[PDB]
Each structure stands twice: as structure tokens, then as C-alpha cells.
Amino acid sequence: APDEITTAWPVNVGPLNPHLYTPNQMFAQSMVYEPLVKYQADGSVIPWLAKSWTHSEDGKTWTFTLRDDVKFSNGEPFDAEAAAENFRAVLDNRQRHAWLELANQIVDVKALSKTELQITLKSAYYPFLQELALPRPFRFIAPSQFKNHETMNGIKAPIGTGPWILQESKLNQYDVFVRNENYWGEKPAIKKITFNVIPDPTTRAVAFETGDIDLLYGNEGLLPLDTFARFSQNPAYHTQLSQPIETVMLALNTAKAPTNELAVREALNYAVNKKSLIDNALYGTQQVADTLFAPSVPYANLGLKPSQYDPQKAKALLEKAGWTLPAGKDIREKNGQPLRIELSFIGTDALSKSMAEIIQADMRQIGADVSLIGEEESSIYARQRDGRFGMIFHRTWGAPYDPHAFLSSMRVPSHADFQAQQGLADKPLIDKEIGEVLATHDETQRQALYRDILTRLHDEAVYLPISYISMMVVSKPELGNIPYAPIATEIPFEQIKPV
Ligand SMILES: N[C@@H](CN[C@@H](CN[C@@H](CC(=O)O)C(=O)O)C(=O)O)C(=O)O
Ligand code: NI
């Protein structure tokens, strides 16, 4: 059936609550729910659910003129009342969204007519419009699907305005989406998409070459990298790599020994032979990362010094910090205690598992004993949130989060950064300066603030940058060339065309 496609994903899409996080998958929230304004590859936004808008002299009050022709997928109208109700449900759970500064800025959301929605901020918050465009939390479920006039405690049906409708959800088996034939924009050419829930990356690969699935669209790590490289040589498949979009790095816990020592974290940054890891384990499909953000990230081309591969420097740094080698033993000890570190990652990620292996062996070469721990994604995120990790795999967030929303998130438990930074004496300063860089309209001062924040995080070796990864695609040749969505976690199913 040509206008239907089957694909695969490590987990289910989740309840598809538009205002909550994992277990909801962002690509799926974005299929069903839509923003007021839509993010573009060039960095701007365009009208979406909001046809047009104005704002006050001081920039604190924004009036949005909504379209009069949008319906939720069950036929109910999307209007200013519905959007206000959504914003109210979101901000009734405001603390959950404190990582994103817009959630701290919205004082009031008023419906003025059926088509006029007024949003009031406590300052002229320049990233306003980009954060409204994100996959979550500021997208719209029909108010009829609230539970007790809230969404923070669950939803009835995942009824959005978008071009896809969640039709069926079988746990640990599949999810099914059908086209919304009453979508207000372009009717997608695909009629139905089935997601098979396949957590093992080898089984996803086999699912593809048996022909059981048509497409794989995800981060590097959705397939074994050696399989993907062979797929790319096979004229019977089609494959793609986008330009790099995210950093993959380890967060090092400056709060827990032994990673709370600067000398230890610097040694670990010298320990990994990244050029070999990339050229070998990852098949040249990435680039060596020396900093938390790539030089191409806005405000991030700071000329920071890289830590290149230097086992001998690493050993010297450990010696001088009192981690020495007993006689006839490979693992350093200090004051009776061997140098042991725990390295946790999401088990279903082929890239994380594969890098964890190389990293472990590289760090043993300098006398550090690293234990690998692979777990379900919910357990890894909870670890990042509460500080229970030694070294934990991490990644930045792509456009448009990088750098401003990623930094904003460092100020509360979010991903691993807040907890990983608790050991830094200048952590409060960094957080103060993150708040300033999000508030300033002075271009010169905005660059100064980014440089200082990013140079402090670099100099104190909070991260072990590994590589800058790309989006990866595998598809039947019939689907032709697949486009990329400007937001890294979204999948542009509505632009795919059958033969
Ligand atoms: N992802 C974890 C924690 N999520 C963070 C916020 N991160 C953003 C961006 C991203 O993850 O690409 C988001 O998730 O929408 C928070 O809750 O502060 C979860 O689902 O809980
Ligand atoms: Ni997140």
C-alpha cells in the first residue's frame, strides 16, 4: 500500500500529553499538536496558528490574531479561548517548566475575542517567539480533553490540530497514526504511519533489511553505525546524513568523587582518543568535538582551547593529584581507594553503548577503572535530574535551543547539567550570568556573557565533548530524498511522498 509507511522506534509514543515530558516522545507530540508560530531553518518563525501579531512599545504585551479556520481533529474549534485554556493548564504546572525561561516570563494569557489572544510577559523577553515554537510545552490540545480542567494530571484523548491523529497504541508493540483529513493546511501525501516498538538496535536494522519497515529517521544511534555504513554502500537502500546538529558529550559530576577533582576531569578529557573513536567505531560519520557547543552554534565561536589526546599528560595530572599506581597494579589508588567511576547511558542507543566501550578502554590506559551502566531512558533521565551519576552520557538540543535554552535549563534540575555543576565554586555566578544573557538587549554584552559562561564551563572541564552528531535517515529508494525538519527532534512526515 503505497501511501502508507511503516517505521520503528525504541519505545512507545507515550500518552501524548502536550504539556508533559518523557514518556511522551517529542516527534509524536509534534505530529499531533501545533504552535502559534513555526520555527524555520534560517532562525526565524512564521505565522502558524497565529496569522499575525502586534506588541506594545515596551515589548511586554503581545496580541496574537489567530486563524478562524482551524479545527481540532475531533471537529471542535481552535480559538482564543481554547489557546488561553491551554496556556492556563501549562502554567498551573509552572514549576515543571522552569527550565524554559518563557515559562517564567508569562504573567497573563487573555482571550479578547474568538480570534484575539493576548499574552503578557514580565519583561521584553526576546526569545519569546522561538520558545513558543518548540515541540512542548506551548502547543494545544482541545480543552474538552482536559481532566478536571487541567492537563498536568493527564488527558482524555490526544486531540490536537495537527496533520496526524493517534489512532492506536499497543504497549511495547506499536503505535499507529492516520492522516487528519480535516487539517487546515496541506493534506500530507502519506495516509497512515505505523511505528513498531523495537528497542534493540540490531533488531531495528534487521527489520529494515527484511523489508519489514520502510524508513528510519533519527539520531545517529538509531542504527548500529557499522550497519548504517554498509546500508550506504547498498544500491538497494537509500541513506542520508544531515550536517551536524548536536553535541554528544559526557556530563562529569563535579559533585561526586572522584570526578569532583579538576585534575581528574582534565585527565579524563586528555584520556579519550576521540579521532580513533570517530574514525573506527563510528565510521567517519561525525566530527571531533572539543567544546560543549560547536563553533557553528550562535555566540559559541570563542576559540576555546581543545584538550587533545594525551595519555602521558593525563597520567601526570593524576599522579600530582595523589592518584598513584600500586606495585604491579593498573588501577590508581588514593589513600587506599582505587580510581573507580561509573558511566551511565541509555541502553537502547547504539552510539552510546559503542562509545562507552571505547571510552572505558581508553580510561583504563591511564589507571581509571570505569564501570558501564546501561538503563532505560526513564531511569537515565531521573539520574540526570537528581545527581546519581559519575559520568553520564548527554547531548545538546539543536536549533533553536542551542545555546540559550540549553543554558537556561542549567539553572534547575533538567537534564544532567545543574547537578553536574553543583561542585563548581562559581556555579551561582554562572547561573546569575545565564539569567543576564537571557535578559540583555545589548549585543556586545550578550556576547561577553556567552563567552564568560562557556569559557568557565570549558576551563573547569565540566564536560567531555565527544563528537558533533547528525541526523541519520534510511529509506526505500521509492520515498526519494527525505527532508530534515529545522527542529532536531521533529520528523517531517508530512513532506514525504510515495511513488
Ligand atoms: N527530556 C527529559 C528532561 N527534559 C527537560 C527539558 N528538555 C527539553 C529538551 C530535550 O529534552 O530535547 C525537553 O525534554 O522538551 C526538563 O524536563 O527539564 C524529560 O523528558 O524529562
Ligand atoms: Ni528534555
JSON list of N, CA, C and O in Angstrom, two decimals, residues 158-203:
[
{"chain": "A", "resi": 158, "resn": "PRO", "atom": "N", "xyz": [-5.71, 12.39, 22.92]},
{"chain": "A", "resi": 158, "resn": "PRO", "atom": "CA", "xyz": [-4.67, 13.32, 22.46]},
{"chain": "A", "resi": 158, "resn": "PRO", "atom": "C", "xyz": [-5.11, 14.12, 21.23]},
{"chain": "A", "resi": 158, "resn": "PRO", "atom": "O", "xyz": [-4.49, 14.06, 20.14]},
{"chain": "A", "resi": 159, "resn": "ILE", "atom": "N", "xyz": [-6.16, 14.90, 21.39]},
{"chain": "A", "resi": 159, "resn": "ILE", "atom": "CA", "xyz": [-6.83, 15.57, 20.28]},
{"chain": "A", "resi": 159, "resn": "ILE", "atom": "C", "xyz": [-6.14, 16.90, 20.02]},
{"chain": "A", "resi": 159, "resn": "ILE", "atom": "O", "xyz": [-6.28, 17.84, 20.80]},
{"chain": "A", "resi": 160, "resn": "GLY", "atom": "N", "xyz": [-5.38, 16.99, 18.92]},
{"chain": "A", "resi": 160, "resn": "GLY", "atom": "CA", "xyz": [-4.72, 18.21, 18.52]},
{"chain": "A", "resi": 160, "resn": "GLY", "atom": "C", "xyz": [-5.31, 18.80, 17.25]},
{"chain": "A", "resi": 160, "resn": "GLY", "atom": "O", "xyz": [-6.34, 18.35, 16.74]},
{"chain": "A", "resi": 161, "resn": "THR", "atom": "N", "xyz": [-4.62, 19.84, 16.74]},
{"chain": "A", "resi": 161, "resn": "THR", "atom": "CA", "xyz": [-4.97, 20.44, 15.45]},
{"chain": "A", "resi": 161, "resn": "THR", "atom": "C", "xyz": [-4.09, 19.94, 14.30]},
{"chain": "A", "resi": 161, "resn": "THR", "atom": "O", "xyz": [-4.35, 20.30, 13.14]},
{"chain": "A", "resi": 162, "resn": "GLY", "atom": "N", "xyz": [-3.06, 19.14, 14.59]},
{"chain": "A", "resi": 162, "resn": "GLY", "atom": "CA", "xyz": [-2.04, 18.83, 13.61]},
{"chain": "A", "resi": 162, "resn": "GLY", "atom": "C", "xyz": [-2.53, 17.90, 12.49]},
{"chain": "A", "resi": 162, "resn": "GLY", "atom": "O", "xyz": [-3.71, 17.51, 12.40]},
{"chain": "A", "resi": 163, "resn": "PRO", "atom": "N", "xyz": [-1.59, 17.56, 11.59]},
{"chain": "A", "resi": 163, "resn": "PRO", "atom": "CA", "xyz": [-1.94, 16.71, 10.45]},
{"chain": "A", "resi": 163, "resn": "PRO", "atom": "C", "xyz": [-1.96, 15.22, 10.75]},
{"chain": "A", "resi": 163, "resn": "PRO", "atom": "O", "xyz": [-2.35, 14.45, 9.87]},
{"chain": "A", "resi": 164, "resn": "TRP", "atom": "N", "xyz": [-1.58, 14.76, 11.94]},
{"chain": "A", "resi": 164, "resn": "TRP", "atom": "CA", "xyz": [-1.62, 13.34, 12.27]},
{"chain": "A", "resi": 164, "resn": "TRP", "atom": "C", "xyz": [-2.50, 13.11, 13.49]},
{"chain": "A", "resi": 164, "resn": "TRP", "atom": "O", "xyz": [-2.56, 13.94, 14.40]},
{"chain": "A", "resi": 165, "resn": "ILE", "atom": "N", "xyz": [-3.18, 11.97, 13.51]},
{"chain": "A", "resi": 165, "resn": "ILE", "atom": "CA", "xyz": [-4.06, 11.59, 14.61]},
{"chain": "A", "resi": 165, "resn": "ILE", "atom": "C", "xyz": [-3.57, 10.26, 15.16]},
{"chain": "A", "resi": 165, "resn": "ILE", "atom": "O", "xyz": [-3.28, 9.34, 14.39]},
{"chain": "A", "resi": 166, "resn": "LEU", "atom": "N", "xyz": [-3.41, 10.18, 16.48]},
{"chain": "A", "resi": 166, "resn": "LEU", "atom": "CA", "xyz": [-3.05, 8.91, 17.10]},
{"chain": "A", "resi": 166, "resn": "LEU", "atom": "C", "xyz": [-4.26, 8.00, 17.03]},
{"chain": "A", "resi": 166, "resn": "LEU", "atom": "O", "xyz": [-5.30, 8.28, 17.64]},
{"chain": "A", "resi": 167, "resn": "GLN", "atom": "N", "xyz": [-4.12, 6.92, 16.28]},
{"chain": "A", "resi": 167, "resn": "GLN", "atom": "CA", "xyz": [-5.25, 6.03, 16.08]},
{"chain": "A", "resi": 167, "resn": "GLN", "atom": "C", "xyz": [-5.21, 4.80, 16.97]},
{"chain": "A", "resi": 167, "resn": "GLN", "atom": "O", "xyz": [-6.27, 4.29, 17.35]},
{"chain": "A", "resi": 168, "resn": "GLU", "atom": "N", "xyz": [-4.03, 4.31, 17.31]},
{"chain": "A", "resi": 168, "resn": "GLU", "atom": "CA", "xyz": [-3.92, 3.10, 18.10]},
{"chain": "A", "resi": 168, "resn": "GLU", "atom": "C", "xyz": [-2.53, 3.03, 18.73]},
{"chain": "A", "resi": 168, "resn": "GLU", "atom": "O", "xyz": [-1.53, 3.45, 18.15]},
{"chain": "A", "resi": 169, "resn": "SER", "atom": "N", "xyz": [-2.50, 2.49, 19.95]},
{"chain": "A", "resi": 169, "resn": "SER", "atom": "CA", "xyz": [-1.32, 2.47, 20.79]},
{"chain": "A", "resi": 169, "resn": "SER", "atom": "C", "xyz": [-1.36, 1.14, 21.54]},
{"chain": "A", "resi": 169, "resn": "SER", "atom": "O", "xyz": [-2.19, 0.98, 22.44]},
{"chain": "A", "resi": 170, "resn": "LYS", "atom": "N", "xyz": [-0.51, 0.19, 21.15]},
{"chain": "A", "resi": 170, "resn": "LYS", "atom": "CA", "xyz": [-0.38, -1.09, 21.85]},
{"chain": "A", "resi": 170, "resn": "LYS", "atom": "C", "xyz": [0.98, -1.11, 22.53]},
{"chain": "A", "resi": 170, "resn": "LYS", "atom": "O", "xyz": [2.02, -0.98, 21.87]},
{"chain": "A", "resi": 171, "resn": "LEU", "atom": "N", "xyz": [0.97, -1.25, 23.86]},
{"chain": "A", "resi": 171, "resn": "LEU", "atom": "CA", "xyz": [2.18, -1.09, 24.65]},
{"chain": "A", "resi": 171, "resn": "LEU", "atom": "C", "xyz": [3.27, -2.10, 24.26]},
{"chain": "A", "resi": 171, "resn": "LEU", "atom": "O", "xyz": [3.01, -3.29, 24.08]},
{"chain": "A", "resi": 172, "resn": "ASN", "atom": "N", "xyz": [4.52, -1.61, 24.16]},
{"chain": "A", "resi": 172, "resn": "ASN", "atom": "CA", "xyz": [5.69, -2.39, 23.76]},
{"chain": "A", "resi": 172, "resn": "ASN", "atom": "C", "xyz": [5.53, -3.08, 22.41]},
{"chain": "A", "resi": 172, "resn": "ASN", "atom": "O", "xyz": [6.35, -3.94, 22.08]},
{"chain": "A", "resi": 173, "resn": "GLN", "atom": "N", "xyz": [4.46, -2.77, 21.66]},
{"chain": "A", "resi": 173, "resn": "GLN", "atom": "CA", "xyz": [4.24, -3.36, 20.33]},
{"chain": "A", "resi": 173, "resn": "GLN", "atom": "C", "xyz": [4.26, -2.31, 19.22]},
{"chain": "A", "resi": 173, "resn": "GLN", "atom": "O", "xyz": [5.20, -2.31, 18.42]},
{"chain": "A", "resi": 174, "resn": "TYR", "atom": "N", "xyz": [3.25, -1.44, 19.12]},
{"chain": "A", "resi": 174, "resn": "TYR", "atom": "CA", "xyz": [3.23, -0.44, 18.05]},
{"chain": "A", "resi": 174, "resn": "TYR", "atom": "C", "xyz": [2.38, 0.77, 18.46]},
{"chain": "A", "resi": 174, "resn": "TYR", "atom": "O", "xyz": [1.63, 0.74, 19.43]},
{"chain": "A", "resi": 175, "resn": "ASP", "atom": "N", "xyz": [2.53, 1.87, 17.69]},
{"chain": "A", "resi": 175, "resn": "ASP", "atom": "CA", "xyz": [1.60, 2.99, 17.66]},
{"chain": "A", "resi": 175, "resn": "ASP", "atom": "C", "xyz": [1.23, 3.27, 16.20]},
{"chain": "A", "resi": 175, "resn": "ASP", "atom": "O", "xyz": [2.05, 3.09, 15.30]},
{"chain": "A", "resi": 176, "resn": "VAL", "atom": "N", "xyz": [-0.01, 3.71, 15.96]},
{"chain": "A", "resi": 176, "resn": "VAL", "atom": "CA", "xyz": [-0.46, 3.98, 14.59]},
{"chain": "A", "resi": 176, "resn": "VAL", "atom": "C", "xyz": [-1.03, 5.38, 14.49]},
{"chain": "A", "resi": 176, "resn": "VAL", "atom": "O", "xyz": [-1.87, 5.78, 15.31]},
{"chain": "A", "resi": 177, "resn": "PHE", "atom": "N", "xyz": [-0.59, 6.12, 13.46]},
{"chain": "A", "resi": 177, "resn": "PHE", "atom": "CA", "xyz": [-1.10, 7.45, 13.17]},
{"chain": "A", "resi": 177, "resn": "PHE", "atom": "C", "xyz": [-1.78, 7.43, 11.82]},
{"chain": "A", "resi": 177, "resn": "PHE", "atom": "O", "xyz": [-1.26, 6.84, 10.86]},
{"chain": "A", "resi": 178, "resn": "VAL", "atom": "N", "xyz": [-2.93, 8.10, 11.71]},
{"chain": "A", "resi": 178, "resn": "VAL", "atom": "CA", "xyz": [-3.54, 8.31, 10.41]},
{"chain": "A", "resi": 178, "resn": "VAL", "atom": "C", "xyz": [-3.58, 9.80, 10.11]},
{"chain": "A", "resi": 178, "resn": "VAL", "atom": "O", "xyz": [-3.53, 10.66, 11.01]},
{"chain": "A", "resi": 179, "resn": "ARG", "atom": "N", "xyz": [-3.62, 10.10, 8.82]},
{"chain": "A", "resi": 179, "resn": "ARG", "atom": "CA", "xyz": [-3.71, 11.47, 8.34]},
{"chain": "A", "resi": 179, "resn": "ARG", "atom": "C", "xyz": [-4.99, 12.12, 8.86]},
{"chain": "A", "resi": 179, "resn": "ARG", "atom": "O", "xyz": [-6.04, 11.47, 8.96]},
{"chain": "A", "resi": 180, "resn": "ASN", "atom": "N", "xyz": [-4.88, 13.40, 9.22]},
{"chain": "A", "resi": 180, "resn": "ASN", "atom": "CA", "xyz": [-6.03, 14.22, 9.58]},
{"chain": "A", "resi": 180, "resn": "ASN", "atom": "C", "xyz": [-6.65, 14.77, 8.31]},
{"chain": "A", "resi": 180, "resn": "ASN", "atom": "O", "xyz": [-6.10, 15.69, 7.69]},
{"chain": "A", "resi": 181, "resn": "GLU", "atom": "N", "xyz": [-7.79, 14.22, 7.89]},
{"chain": "A", "resi": 181, "resn": "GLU", "atom": "CA", "xyz": [-8.40, 14.68, 6.64]},
{"chain": "A", "resi": 181, "resn": "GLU", "atom": "C", "xyz": [-9.12, 16.02, 6.80]},
{"chain": "A", "resi": 181, "resn": "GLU", "atom": "O", "xyz": [-9.72, 16.50, 5.83]},
{"chain": "A", "resi": 182, "resn": "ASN", "atom": "N", "xyz": [-9.09, 16.62, 7.98]},
{"chain": "A", "resi": 182, "resn": "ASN", "atom": "CA", "xyz": [-9.67, 17.93, 8.23]},
{"chain": "A", "resi": 182, "resn": "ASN", "atom": "C", "xyz": [-8.61, 18.89, 8.75]},
{"chain": "A", "resi": 182, "resn": "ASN", "atom": "O", "xyz": [-8.92, 19.82, 9.51]},
{"chain": "A", "resi": 183, "resn": "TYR", "atom": "N", "xyz": [-7.36, 18.64, 8.38]},
{"chain": "A", "resi": 183, "resn": "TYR", "atom": "CA", "xyz": [-6.26, 19.54, 8.66]},
{"chain": "A", "resi": 183, "resn": "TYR", "atom": "C", "xyz": [-6.43, 20.82, 7.87]},
{"chain": "A", "resi": 183, "resn": "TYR", "atom": "O", "xyz": [-6.91, 20.81, 6.73]},
{"chain": "A", "resi": 184, "resn": "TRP", "atom": "N", "xyz": [-6.05, 21.93, 8.49]},
{"chain": "A", "resi": 184, "resn": "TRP", "atom": "CA", "xyz": [-6.32, 23.24, 7.90]},
{"chain": "A", "resi": 184, "resn": "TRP", "atom": "C", "xyz": [-5.31, 23.62, 6.82]},
{"chain": "A", "resi": 184, "resn": "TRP", "atom": "O", "xyz": [-5.62, 24.47, 5.98]},
{"chain": "A", "resi": 185, "resn": "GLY", "atom": "N", "xyz": [-4.12, 23.02, 6.83]},
{"chain": "A", "resi": 185, "resn": "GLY", "atom": "CA", "xyz": [-3.11, 23.25, 5.83]},
{"chain": "A", "resi": 185, "resn": "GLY", "atom": "C", "xyz": [-3.10, 22.16, 4.78]},
{"chain": "A", "resi": 185, "resn": "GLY", "atom": "O", "xyz": [-4.15, 21.59, 4.44]},
{"chain": "A", "resi": 186, "resn": "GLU", "atom": "N", "xyz": [-1.91, 21.84, 4.29]},
{"chain": "A", "resi": 186, "resn": "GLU", "atom": "CA", "xyz": [-1.77, 20.91, 3.18]},
{"chain": "A", "resi": 186, "resn": "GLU", "atom": "C", "xyz": [-2.05, 19.49, 3.65]},
{"chain": "A", "resi": 186, "resn": "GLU", "atom": "O", "xyz": [-1.61, 19.07, 4.72]},
{"chain": "A", "resi": 187, "resn": "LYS", "atom": "N", "xyz": [-2.82, 18.76, 2.87]},
{"chain": "A", "resi": 187, "resn": "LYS", "atom": "CA", "xyz": [-3.06, 17.36, 3.19]},
{"chain": "A", "resi": 187, "resn": "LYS", "atom": "C", "xyz": [-1.78, 16.56, 2.94]},
{"chain": "A", "resi": 187, "resn": "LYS", "atom": "O", "xyz": [-1.30, 16.52, 1.80]},
{"chain": "A", "resi": 188, "resn": "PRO", "atom": "N", "xyz": [-1.16, 15.95, 3.97]},
{"chain": "A", "resi": 188, "resn": "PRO", "atom": "CA", "xyz": [0.02, 15.11, 3.72]},
{"chain": "A", "resi": 188, "resn": "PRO", "atom": "C", "xyz": [-0.27, 14.01, 2.71]},
{"chain": "A", "resi": 188, "resn": "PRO", "atom": "O", "xyz": [-1.37, 13.46, 2.64]},
{"chain": "A", "resi": 189, "resn": "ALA", "atom": "N", "xyz": [0.75, 13.66, 1.92]},
{"chain": "A", "resi": 189, "resn": "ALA", "atom": "CA", "xyz": [0.53, 12.61, 0.91]},
{"chain": "A", "resi": 189, "resn": "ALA", "atom": "C", "xyz": [0.51, 11.21, 1.52]},
{"chain": "A", "resi": 189, "resn": "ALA", "atom": "O", "xyz": [-0.11, 10.31, 0.94]},
{"chain": "A", "resi": 190, "resn": "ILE", "atom": "N", "xyz": [1.15, 11.01, 2.68]},
{"chain": "A", "resi": 190, "resn": "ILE", "atom": "CA", "xyz": [1.06, 9.75, 3.40]},
{"chain": "A", "resi": 190, "resn": "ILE", "atom": "C", "xyz": [-0.27, 9.68, 4.15]},
{"chain": "A", "resi": 190, "resn": "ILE", "atom": "O", "xyz": [-0.67, 10.64, 4.85]},
{"chain": "A", "resi": 191, "resn": "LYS", "atom": "N", "xyz": [-0.96, 8.55, 4.04]},
{"chain": "A", "resi": 191, "resn": "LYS", "atom": "CA", "xyz": [-2.23, 8.38, 4.72]},
{"chain": "A", "resi": 191, "resn": "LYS", "atom": "C", "xyz": [-2.09, 7.80, 6.13]},
{"chain": "A", "resi": 191, "resn": "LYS", "atom": "O", "xyz": [-2.89, 8.14, 7.01]},
{"chain": "A", "resi": 192, "resn": "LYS", "atom": "N", "xyz": [-1.12, 6.91, 6.37]},
{"chain": "A", "resi": 192, "resn": "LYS", "atom": "CA", "xyz": [-1.01, 6.19, 7.63]},
{"chain": "A", "resi": 192, "resn": "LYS", "atom": "C", "xyz": [0.46, 5.88, 7.89]},
{"chain": "A", "resi": 192, "resn": "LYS", "atom": "O", "xyz": [1.20, 5.56, 6.96]},
{"chain": "A", "resi": 193, "resn": "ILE", "atom": "N", "xyz": [0.86, 5.96, 9.16]},
{"chain": "A", "resi": 193, "resn": "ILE", "atom": "CA", "xyz": [2.21, 5.66, 9.61]},
{"chain": "A", "resi": 193, "resn": "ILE", "atom": "C", "xyz": [2.11, 4.73, 10.80]},
{"chain": "A", "resi": 193, "resn": "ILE", "atom": "O", "xyz": [1.44, 5.04, 11.79]},
{"chain": "A", "resi": 194, "resn": "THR", "atom": "N", "xyz": [2.80, 3.60, 10.73]},
{"chain": "A", "resi": 194, "resn": "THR", "atom": "CA", "xyz": [2.83, 2.65, 11.83]},
{"chain": "A", "resi": 194, "resn": "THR", "atom": "C", "xyz": [4.23, 2.65, 12.42]},
{"chain": "A", "resi": 194, "resn": "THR", "atom": "O", "xyz": [5.21, 2.49, 11.68]},
{"chain": "A", "resi": 195, "resn": "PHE", "atom": "N", "xyz": [4.31, 2.84, 13.74]},
{"chain": "A", "resi": 195, "resn": "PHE", "atom": "CA", "xyz": [5.56, 2.78, 14.50]},
{"chain": "A", "resi": 195, "resn": "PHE", "atom": "C", "xyz": [5.61, 1.44, 15.20]},
{"chain": "A", "resi": 195, "resn": "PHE", "atom": "O", "xyz": [4.82, 1.19, 16.11]},
{"chain": "A", "resi": 196, "resn": "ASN", "atom": "N", "xyz": [6.56, 0.58, 14.80]},
{"chain": "A", "resi": 196, "resn": "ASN", "atom": "CA", "xyz": [6.81, -0.66, 15.54]},
{"chain": "A", "resi": 196, "resn": "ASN", "atom": "C", "xyz": [7.77, -0.36, 16.68]},
{"chain": "A", "resi": 196, "resn": "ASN", "atom": "O", "xyz": [8.79, 0.30, 16.47]},
{"chain": "A", "resi": 197, "resn": "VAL", "atom": "N", "xyz": [7.44, -0.83, 17.87]},
{"chain": "A", "resi": 197, "resn": "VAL", "atom": "CA", "xyz": [8.27, -0.58, 19.06]},
{"chain": "A", "resi": 197, "resn": "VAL", "atom": "C", "xyz": [9.36, -1.65, 19.10]},
{"chain": "A", "resi": 197, "resn": "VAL", "atom": "O", "xyz": [9.11, -2.79, 19.49]},
{"chain": "A", "resi": 198, "resn": "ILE", "atom": "N", "xyz": [10.58, -1.29, 18.72]},
{"chain": "A", "resi": 198, "resn": "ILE", "atom": "CA", "xyz": [11.72, -2.21, 18.66]},
{"chain": "A", "resi": 198, "resn": "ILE", "atom": "C", "xyz": [12.89, -1.59, 19.42]},
{"chain": "A", "resi": 198, "resn": "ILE", "atom": "O", "xyz": [13.61, -0.75, 18.86]},
{"chain": "A", "resi": 199, "resn": "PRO", "atom": "N", "xyz": [13.11, -1.96, 20.69]},
{"chain": "A", "resi": 199, "resn": "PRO", "atom": "CA", "xyz": [14.18, -1.31, 21.47]},
{"chain": "A", "resi": 199, "resn": "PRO", "atom": "C", "xyz": [15.60, -1.74, 21.12]},
{"chain": "A", "resi": 199, "resn": "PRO", "atom": "O", "xyz": [16.54, -0.98, 21.40]},
{"chain": "A", "resi": 200, "resn": "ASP", "atom": "N", "xyz": [15.80, -2.95, 20.57]},
{"chain": "A", "resi": 200, "resn": "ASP", "atom": "CA", "xyz": [17.16, -3.40, 20.23]},
{"chain": "A", "resi": 200, "resn": "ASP", "atom": "C", "xyz": [17.63, -2.82, 18.89]},
{"chain": "A", "resi": 200, "resn": "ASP", "atom": "O", "xyz": [16.91, -2.93, 17.89]},
{"chain": "A", "resi": 201, "resn": "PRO", "atom": "N", "xyz": [18.79, -2.15, 18.84]},
{"chain": "A", "resi": 201, "resn": "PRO", "atom": "CA", "xyz": [19.20, -1.50, 17.57]},
{"chain": "A", "resi": 201, "resn": "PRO", "atom": "C", "xyz": [19.53, -2.49, 16.46]},
{"chain": "A", "resi": 201, "resn": "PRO", "atom": "O", "xyz": [19.31, -2.17, 15.29]},
{"chain": "A", "resi": 202, "resn": "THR", "atom": "N", "xyz": [20.03, -3.69, 16.79]},
{"chain": "A", "resi": 202, "resn": "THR", "atom": "CA", "xyz": [20.21, -4.73, 15.77]},
{"chain": "A", "resi": 202, "resn": "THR", "atom": "C", "xyz": [18.87, -5.21, 15.22]},
{"chain": "A", "resi": 202, "resn": "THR", "atom": "O", "xyz": [18.73, -5.44, 14.01]},
{"chain": "A", "resi": 203, "resn": "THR", "atom": "N", "xyz": [17.84, -5.33, 16.08]},
{"chain": "A", "resi": 203, "resn": "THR", "atom": "CA", "xyz": [16.55, -5.77, 15.57]},
{"chain": "A", "resi": 203, "resn": "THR", "atom": "C", "xyz": [15.92, -4.70, 14.68]},
{"chain": "A", "resi": 203, "resn": "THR", "atom": "O", "xyz": [15.23, -5.04, 13.71]}
]
